[PDB]
Write a protein that binds this ligand. Structure first.
Ligand SMILES: NC(=O)c1ccc[n+]([C@@H]2O[C@H](COP(=O)([O-])OP(=O)(O)OC[C@H]3O[C@@H](n4cnc5c(N)ncnc54)[C@H](OP(=O)(O)O)[C@@H]3O)[C@@H](O)[C@H]2O)c1
Ligand SMILES: Nc1nc(=O)c2nc(CNc3ccc(C(=O)N[C@@H](CCC(=O)O)C(=O)O)cc3)cnc2[nH]1
Ligand SMILES: [Mn+2]
Ligand SMILES: [Mn+2]
Length: 159
């Protein structure tokens, strides 16, 4: 099973100038909880924006170019990325935009955080067909002293 996990601002914005223009520690805790002890697949731009290996996860990077860091696994196609994960229950795809686009057709689950923030962006989550997905979990949170915006955690499963 393949799952996507992402945080979306208004209009499905997910990034700007290779960074995320918000700080929501609650969402990062959610990200960590849902990805720990699982392989994570990311594109090269996302690897660069993160800047180091994510601990306690097998880090797999998609690049058409040879790898430049042996602390992570480098693969050159979607099929190789999947094979590199082995036989695990759940593979987590952590973006960015181009990688989300390619793995969406294969995904059975989406872990989405909807953030009530208006940000200009240059990267967007794919336009997924809402009829194909069932919402099985949602949990809304108002803003607080640590999290500057309200946000909703949602898990959707392909029908
Ligand atoms: N809000 C969120 O949940 C979230 C999550 C993740 C990322 N982001 C944001 O998204 C942005 C980065 O996304 P992005 O779309 O620009 O880049 P990306 O998808 O992270 O990486 C794109 C790169 O991945 C490699 N790649 C993708 N598909 C491949 C394939 N099939 N075979 C071989 N290599 C492949 C290529 O690297 P080469 O050029 O080396 O071939 C490509 O240039 C940043 O702003 C980041 O902060 C946001
Ligand atoms: N829901 C969600 N939120 C995100 O911010 C997010 N970010 C990416 C890619 N960007 C990043 C950037 C930083 C870290 C990170 O530093 N996480 C650490 C710390 C967790 C914490 O602070 O509690 C980790 O161990 O996962 C992860 C992904 C992909 N999917 C996401 N999905
Ligand atoms: Mn080596
Ligand atoms: Mn807001």
């Amino acid at each position: 099973m393949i799952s996507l996990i992402a945080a979306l601002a208004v209009d499905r914005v997910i990034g700007m100038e290779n960074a995320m223009p918000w700080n929501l520690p609650a969402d990062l805790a959610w990200f960590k909880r849902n990805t720990l002890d699982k392989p994570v697949i990311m594109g090269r731009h996302t690897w660069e924006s993160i800047g180091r290996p994510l601990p306690g996860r097998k880090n797999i990077i998609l690049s058409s170019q040879p790898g430049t860091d042996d602390r992570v696994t480098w693969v050159k196609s979607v099929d190789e990325a999947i094979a590199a994960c082995g036989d695990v229950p759940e593979i987590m795809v952590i973006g960015g935009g181009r990688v989300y686009e390619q793995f969406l057709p294969k995904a059975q689950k989406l872990y989405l955080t909807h953030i009530d923030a208006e940000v200009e962006g240059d990267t967007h989550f794919p336009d997924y067909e809402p009829d194909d997905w069932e919402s099985v979990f949602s949990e809304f949170h108002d803003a607080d002293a640590q999290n500057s915006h309200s946000y909703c955690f949602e898990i959707l499963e392909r029908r």
